[PDB]
Design a protein around this ligand. Structure first.
Ligand SMILES: [Zn+2]
Ligand SMILES: [Zn+2]
Ligand SMILES: [Zn+2]
Length: 84
DNA sequence: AGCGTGGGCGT
DNA sequence: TACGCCCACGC
């Protein structure tokens, strides 16, 4: 990790410089992606993609056991474990 | 449950 | 750079 955050209060370090460039948005407060629906801003395009599903009700991820649908794969993952 | 949001990293 | 997921933490 040759790339450290130059911010005074922060001690984080990164392997790839591009990851620090993304991280630095936490301190500058830049949120480049906007929701056309509710006008809310987001720091990441991937998080913007999933936020919009809270409006459309789109749920691409169904549980392998019962078939209950989820907007994000991680919610389905958190759910599947309840069948154990 | 509903879902924000950072870290690791692949395309 | 710009984007897209997995994985995880958090409220
Ligand atoms: Zn920092
Ligand atoms: Zn929105
Ligand atoms: Zn299920």
């Amino acid at each position: 990790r040759p790339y450290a955050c130059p911010v005074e209060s922060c001690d984080r370090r990164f392997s790839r410089s591009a990851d620090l460039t993304r991280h630095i948005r936490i301190h500058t407060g830049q949120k480049p992606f906007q929701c056309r629906i509710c006008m809310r801003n987001f720091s990441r395009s991937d998080h913007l993609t999933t936020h919009i599903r809270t409006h459309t009700g789109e749920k691409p991820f169904a549980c392998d056991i019962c078939g209950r649908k989820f907007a994000r794969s991680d919610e389905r993952k958190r759910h599947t474990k309840i069948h154990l």
